[PDB]
Write a protein that binds this ligand. Structure first.
Ligand SMILES: Nc1nc2c(ncn2[C@@H]2O[C@H](COP(=O)(O)OP(=O)(O)O)[C@@H](O)[C@H]2O)c(=O)[nH]1
Length: 335
């Protein structure tokens, strides 16, 4: 490429706004998330799948696969015991470290409540912190119908994650039943899949994807470095006032299971068809800004999704909500 000294300096500036990003999916649900991200083609991110279960791991699609606890469970799994998942991850700590080495940002994703995910996720998070990466977890809490043991295990895992994350994005699966009431559990998991994909892919591609408005990693780091506890809101609309309806739906999302007045920061990803305008994106941001505390630090981007024909989708990630939430054995309680 023919490049002038001025063009080179411009390219150098744009390069330092980028980040090396790795997404790590732990356990059954985490592996399923990774497969979907790999097939759909998540932009600018390395995908790593880890599991104690060799049957689940081998059918997963990923850039890198790690069978954890080879000398512990021999590829059998963890049988829903978080202690087994934790010990397996600790055994394979060096292999996990090698796979995420030199990442500027690491996403850790799983369904909390099981053995492998609940156990290994905090270990991956600890390893990520120790390599100096911006460490973000995007995790689900189980449905109520899964039982008390699953939720108790999940909440203990959430407490361990909190010790080793910069931002902890929590998605309560139970609130999906407000979006799709009385859905069969097996199909409700498929909805949970889509939400996890939207959350992880949406956060990653806010930084990595070509957009109308691209985001500097420095600005993401400024919000997410001490993001604490975070929750998401998703909205979509294809009407005449698509942007207004999408942001309204996002702000009123059941997944935002918190008083949003306690928020100290926010990430906004506006997604639309080829006809998406800056004016539409600005309308979304202005609506969020007016609703939140005036002192909240808001970072936003806008990208074109080719799969969308007439629909604008808004992903909202609200940070610093730990002051309005209490961690209990039965789940998240509003304070
Ligand atoms: N999105 C999604 N979540 C799931 C699925 N299966 C289970 N989960 C959730 O993830 C939690 C842990 O399940 P799983 O990943 O299979 O356990 P693990 O392999 O031992 O970590 C469960 O308590 C469920 O709430 C699935 O197919 N999709």
């Amino acid at each position: 490429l023919e490049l002038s000294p001025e063009d080179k300096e411009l390219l150098e500036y744009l390069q330092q706004t980028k980040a090396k990003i790795t997404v790590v999916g732990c356990g059954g649900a985490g592996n399923n998330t990774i497969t979907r991200l790999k097939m759909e083609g998540i932009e600018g991110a390395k995908t790593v799948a880890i599991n104690t279960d060799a049957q689940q791991l081998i059918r997963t699609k990923a850039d890198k696969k790690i069978l954890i606890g080879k000398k512990l469970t021999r590829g059998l799994g963890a049988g829903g015991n978080p202690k087994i998942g934790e010990e397996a991850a600790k055994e394979s700590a060096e292999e996990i470290k090698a796979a995420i080495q030199d990442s500027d940002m690491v996403f850790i994703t799983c369904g909390l409540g099981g053995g492998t995910g609940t156990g290994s996720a905090p270990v991956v998070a600890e390893i990520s912190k120790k390599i100096g990466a911006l460490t973000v977890a995007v995790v689900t809490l189980p449905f109520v119908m899964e039982g008390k043991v699953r939720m108790k295990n999940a909440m203990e895992g959430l407490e361990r994650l909190k010790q080793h994350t910069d931002t902890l994005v929590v998605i309560p699966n139970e609130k999906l039943f407000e979006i799709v009431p009385n859905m069969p559990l097996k199909l409700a998991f498929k909805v949970a899949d889509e939400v996890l994909i939207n959350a992880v892919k949406g956060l990653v591609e806010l930084i990595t994807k070509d957009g109308l408005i691209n985001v500097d990693f420095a600005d993401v780091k400024a919000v997410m470095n001490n993001g604490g506890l975070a929750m998401i809101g998703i909205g979509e609309s294809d009407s005449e006032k698509r942007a207004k309806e999408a942001v309204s739906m996002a702000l009123n999302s059941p997944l935002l299971d918190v008083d949003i007045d306690g928020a100290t920061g926010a990430l906004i990803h506006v997604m639309g068809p080829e006809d998406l305008t800056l004016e539409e994106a600005r309308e979304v941001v202005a609506t969020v800004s007016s609703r939140l505390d005036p002192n909240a630090t808001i970072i936003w981007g806008a990208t074109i999704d080719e799969n969308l024909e007439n629909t604008v989708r808004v992903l909202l990630v609200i940070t610093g909500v730990q002051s309005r939430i209490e961690f209990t054995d039965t789940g998240l309680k509003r304070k």
